[PDB]
Amino acid sequence: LTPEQIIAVDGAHLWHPYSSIGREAVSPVVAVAAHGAWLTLIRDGQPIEVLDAMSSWWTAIHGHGHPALDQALTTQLRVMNHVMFGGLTHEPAARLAKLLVDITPAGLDTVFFSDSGSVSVEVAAKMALQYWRGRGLPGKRRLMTWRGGYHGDTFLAMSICDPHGGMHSLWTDVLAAQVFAPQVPRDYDPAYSAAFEAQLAQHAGELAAVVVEPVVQGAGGMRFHDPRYLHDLRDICRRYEVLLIFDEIATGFGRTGALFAADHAGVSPDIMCVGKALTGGYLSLAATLCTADVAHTISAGAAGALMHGPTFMANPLACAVSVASVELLLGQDWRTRITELAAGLTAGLDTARALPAVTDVRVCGAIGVIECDRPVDLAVATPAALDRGVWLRPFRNLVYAMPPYICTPAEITQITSAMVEVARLVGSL
Amino acid sequence: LTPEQIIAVDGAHLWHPYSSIGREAVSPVVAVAAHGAWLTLIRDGQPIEVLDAMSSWWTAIHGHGHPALDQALTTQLRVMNHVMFGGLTHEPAARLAKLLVDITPAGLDTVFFSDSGSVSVEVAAKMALQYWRGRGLPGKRRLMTWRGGYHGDTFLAMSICDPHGGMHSLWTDVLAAQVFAPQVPRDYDPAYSAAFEAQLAQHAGELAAVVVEPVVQGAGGMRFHDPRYLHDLRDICRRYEVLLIFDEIATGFGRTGALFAADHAGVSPDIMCVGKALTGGYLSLAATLCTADVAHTISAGAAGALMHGPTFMANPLACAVSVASVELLLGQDWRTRITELAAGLTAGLDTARALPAVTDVRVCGAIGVIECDRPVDLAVATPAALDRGVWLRPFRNLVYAMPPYICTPAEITQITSAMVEVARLVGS
Numbered sequence: 047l048t049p050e051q052i053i054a055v056d057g058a059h060l061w062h063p064y065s066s067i068g069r070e071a072v073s074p075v076v077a078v079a080a081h082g083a084w085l086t087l088i089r090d091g092q093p094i095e096v097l098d099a100m101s102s103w104w105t106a107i108h109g110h111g112h113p114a115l116d117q118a119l120t121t122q123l124r125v126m127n128h129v130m131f132g133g134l135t136h137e138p139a140a141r142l143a144k145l146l147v148d149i150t151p152a153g154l155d156t157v158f159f160s161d162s163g164s165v166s167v168e169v170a171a172k173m174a175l176q177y178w179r180g181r182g183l184p185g186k187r188r189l190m191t192w193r194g195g196y197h198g199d200t201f202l203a204m205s206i207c208d209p210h211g212g213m214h215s216l217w218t219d220v221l222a223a224q225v226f227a228p229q230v231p232r233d234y235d236p237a238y239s240a241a242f243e244a245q246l247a248q249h250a251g252e253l254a255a256v257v258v259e260p261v262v263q264g265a266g267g268m269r270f271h272d273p274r275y276l277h278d279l280r281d282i283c284r285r286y287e288v289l290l291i292f293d294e295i296a297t298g299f300g301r302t303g304a305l306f307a308a309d310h311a312g313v314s315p316d317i318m319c320v321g322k323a324l325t326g327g328y329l330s331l332a333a334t335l336c337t338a339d340v341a342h343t344i345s346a347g348a349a350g351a352l353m354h355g356p357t358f359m360a361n362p363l364a365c366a367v368s369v370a371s372v373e374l375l376l377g378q379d380w381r382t383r384i385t386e387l388a389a390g391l392t393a394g395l396d397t398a399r400a401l402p403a404v405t406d407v408r409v410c411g412a413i414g415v416i417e418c419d420r421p422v423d424l425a426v427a428t429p430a431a432l433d434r435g436v437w438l439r440p441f442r443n444l445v446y447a448m449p450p451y452i453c454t455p456a457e458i459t460q461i462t463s464a465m466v467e468v469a470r471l472v473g474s475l
Numbered sequence: 476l477t478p479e480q481i482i483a484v485d486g487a488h489l490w491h492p493y494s495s496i497g498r499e500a501v502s503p504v505v506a507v508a509a510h511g512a513w514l515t516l517i518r519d520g521q522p523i524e525v526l527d528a529m530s531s532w533w534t535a536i537h538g539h540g541h542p543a544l545d546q547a548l549t550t551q552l553r554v555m556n557h558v559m560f561g562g563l564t565h566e567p568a569a570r571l572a573k574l575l576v577d578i579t580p581a582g583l584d585t586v587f588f589s590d591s592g593s594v595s596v597e598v599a600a601k602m603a604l605q606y607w608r609g610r611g612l613p614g615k616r617r618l619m620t621w622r623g624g625y626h627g628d629t630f631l632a633m634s635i636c637d638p639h640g641g642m643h644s645l646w647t648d649v650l651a652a653q654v655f656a657p658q659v660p661r662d663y664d665p666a667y668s669a670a671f672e673a674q675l676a677q678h679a680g681e682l683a684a685v686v687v688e689p690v691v692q693g694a695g696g697m698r699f700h701d702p703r704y705l706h707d708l709r710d711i712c713r714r715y716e717v718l719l720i721f722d723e724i725a726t727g728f729g730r731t732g733a734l735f736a737a738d739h740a741g742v743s744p745d746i747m748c749v750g751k752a753l754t755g756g757y758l759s760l761a762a763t764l765c766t767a768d769v770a771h772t773i774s775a776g777a778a779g780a781l782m783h784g785p786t787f788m789a790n791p792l793a794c795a796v797s798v799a800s801v802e803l804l805l806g807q808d809w810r811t812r813i814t815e816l817a818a819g820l821t822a823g824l825d826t827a828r829a830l831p832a833v834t835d836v837r838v839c840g841a842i843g844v845i846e847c848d849r850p851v852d853l854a855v856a857t858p859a860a861l862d863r864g865v866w867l868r869p870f871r872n873l874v875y876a877m878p879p880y881i882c883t884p885a886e887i888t889q890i891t892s893a894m895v896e897v898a899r900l901v902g903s
């Protein structure tokens with residue numbers, strides 16, 4: 047198909063994320079190639095190279111078509127594409143499980159593989175519910191979180207997403223009614239944690255778990271909070287016997303400047319989800335980890351098992367690339383890489399603070415955010431960034447980047463320059 | 476890792492489908508290769524080649540490592556592994572969506588890609604709920620199904636799975652309470668459809684959709700029902716203004732002897748899900764299709780959009796291997812192949828009817844089932860079949876197979892022989 051044929055088919059037949067059919071303000075841009083930090087996109091019938099400043103939605107940490115990850119895929123392809131995980135096991139699952147339990151916060155000793163972040167969140171919720179049932183406390187079935195969060199799009203996942211951002215108006219009484227604390231502030235405020243505890247105390251007997259994104263809330267608004275809150279959450283959860291679940295689907299694998307965002311606080315959750323960067327952005331794969339105690343309590347309960355088992359559970363191909371992606375990350379000085387990346391974002395985004403439409407500029411590891419005073423118009427922003435050789439996709443009032451770890455200092459400055467120019471335009475109407 | 480090392484890591488750290496940690500009666504068997512219809516498994520520490528009678532849980536329709544599918548993946552890998560589907564589109568998505576709209580039952584014009592069957596089911600449910608909100612009828616939010624079904628493991632999907640199979644007993648107070656009709660029978664009985672309609676009619680004002688597996692109910696018990704039931708459901712849903720959703724995640728792509736099981740009935744659902752065999756068993760991918768009416772109504776609704784968007788939506792690699800898989804199926808006489816396989820299954824399973832513990836033997840396309848009168852002991856059944864060069868995984872009282880379409884007559888004879896032998900041992 048030609049780019050124009052692809053556009054025709056797409057407009058008629060393809061749903062996009064959170065999109066309409068037939069009512070799109072802009073056609074999607076055709077992508078024809080991806081290599082390293084660069085995408086080849088079609089603009090006015092001509093191919094252009096632009097930087098993937100979004101890491102293709104947080105996924106492409108090593109960039110596209112990395113030889114180590116390509117080779118990992120083709121090597122696994124040559125022996126075994128997939129077998130069912132019911133009754134069989136294999137080397138890719140075992141290797142990845144071994145790696146994951148070694149590098150995640152201490153105590154996370156078992157691994158349940160699934161195909162997407164949303165599913166891994168539901169698995170985590172199931173683990174928590176079956177846990178309490180194994181303890182003779184089936185009343186403990188609700189979840190608690192803070193506002194501003196995002197945990198995926200399946201119906202249990204939605205129930206703990208920010209109610210305003212996810213227009214929960216659309217749903218309910220179909221959505222489960224969960225417990226929400228106020229938005230967690232950026233700066234540490236002991237009063238917030240005290241009120242969180244007081245709220246939790248009122249519901250402790252009906253709560254299976256607190257579920258939060260640690261340090262960075264992604265799709266809910268690219269907000270950062272002080273890691274000390276996570277220490278408070280751990281303590282509250284321990285004292286009130288509520289499980290603590292960290293959703294690290296966006297934050298995992300070095301993105302915030304630590305291997306996992308929990309590491310900024312030295313905190314171990316009872317249950318943890320990982321996903322987006324797990325395969326280096328090649329294939330869908332997620333994992334839910336839990337402690338030995340959680341696993342043994344579920345296993346000793348009425349069901350005798352965790353009642354979940356996706357078709358492609360522990361897919362050999364996905365597990366193989368993920369093994370290579372994690373090993374590639376661990377085999378280099380990733381911490382220095384991310385620190386340098388953050389310094390580049392900070393230096394490059396500084397001039398945005400003085401722009402009329404800009405409310406905040408914030409950086410946390412390989413995450414750079416310009417917060418504007420109005421919703422960013424994509425019909426203006428997207429082509430403006432493409433004119434500057436960068437793929438940017440703002441959402442709501444945010445012009446942001448989560449660049450691949452392989453971006454050079456020059457590439458980071460090109461990315462931040464484009465973000466600055468988009469923000470300048472936002473203040474021009 | 477060596478097989479011995481794999482087993483050790485596995486026992487300590489790996490969950491399996493619906494399994495325990497530390498309480499497994501039998502270790503899982505180490506798989507080390509898969510080629511064509513055969514798996515290489517480790518038995519007594521030695522690699523042995525056995526037939527994948529289960530198609531690796533319905534997925535491996537063209538067998539493992541099919542040169543055309545390996546090549547499709549390898550070719551895409553050199554071009555573009557993945558890009559975000561927010562604000563971008565690409566050739567593998569467009570090619571696959573065109574194929575899928577062309578070959579599915581008439582009227583399914585739009586395609587929402589996701590990464591698994593359970594997600595595609597929740598997407599279908601979301602489409603139904605947003606559709607009726609768009610029509611100014613927000614009370615229409617419940618689902619109706621018949622018993623015996625399986626639709627996946629996410630919490631909404633669980634709410635329409637069979638209450639007994641799904642151990643809803645362990646879920647008291649957490650699942651949505653849905654509307655269940657009695658088990659749909661094998662043989663066509665107009666009284667069943669009339670009762671179904673009467674039950675639906677009294678709930679019509681609160682029902683968004685009927686959701687069923689068409690013709691074959693898989694993980695809920697490998698039960699077949701007369702296609703005419705689906706004709707009746709289409710009629711009932713039309714007349715009572717309730718959307719009809721077929722979950723073809725197990726039945727799709729030729730498995731029941733029609734390209735999609737809805738084709739047996741000559742009926743089109745408003746929303747359809749596909750998944751397991753979509754990529755030919757290479758990679759996780761699923762799709763939810765809906766009519767233009769559903770799509771336009773959602774898009775004119777209050778959200779102005781379907782409120783869903785998975786990270787890996789329309790992944791180029793998965794879409795590329797799916798295109799090759801679907802084209803491979805469509806470019807051969809698949810209909811004859813499935814007919815031959817069904818004949819092979821019928822002939823090979825016939826002697827099992829006489830066996831003392833066997834209550835039923837049934838075949839539908841490339842699906843063969845021996846139903847026994849008691850639970851099949853996996854500790855006995857599985858090494859028994861392995862002894863005979865076949866990988867089989869019974870569940871409950873069922874010894875069954877969904878072999879790859881590439882299985883030769885000799886291979887079907889071998890699978891069926893092993894199945895008969897497992898059923899014999901059950902009677903002991």
Ligand SMILES: CCN(CC)c1ccc2cc(C(=O)c3cccs3)c(=O)oc2c1
Nearest residue numbers: 130132355356357492493532640641694
């Ligand atoms: C909810 C219905 N049940 C009964 C508890 C199911 C459903 C599906 C499976 C799938 C199983 C399985 O074999 C596989 C799941 C995914 C790849 S193979 C399994 O062992 O137990 C199940 C049990």
Ligand SMILES: CCN(CC)c1ccc2cc(C(=O)c3cccs3)c(=O)oc2c1
Nearest residue numbers: 063064103212265559560561784785786
């Ligand atoms: C439920 C929160 N919302 C609604 C405001 C979200 C959440 C996530 C996305 C992701 C989007 C997206 O760009 C992508 C989704 C998957 C790959 S890219 C998007 O366009 O809109 C969203 C909207």
Ligand SMILES: *Cc1c(COP(=O)(O)O)cnc(C)c1O
Nearest residue numbers: 162163164197198295296785786
């Ligand atoms: C993206 C994301 C999810 C959902 O992952 P999918 O693969 O899109 O289903 C869940 N939680 C967090 C924190 C995320 O960033």
Ligand SMILES: *Cc1c(COP(=O)(O)O)cnc(C)c1O
Nearest residue numbers: 356357591592593626627724725
């Ligand atoms: C397997 C199956 C599902 C769920 O698919 P996963 O990919 O395992 O989540 C849904 N519906 C039917 C009919 C199935 O057979």
Ligand SMILES: [Cl-]
Nearest residue numbers: 709741742743
């Ligand atoms: Cl019809």
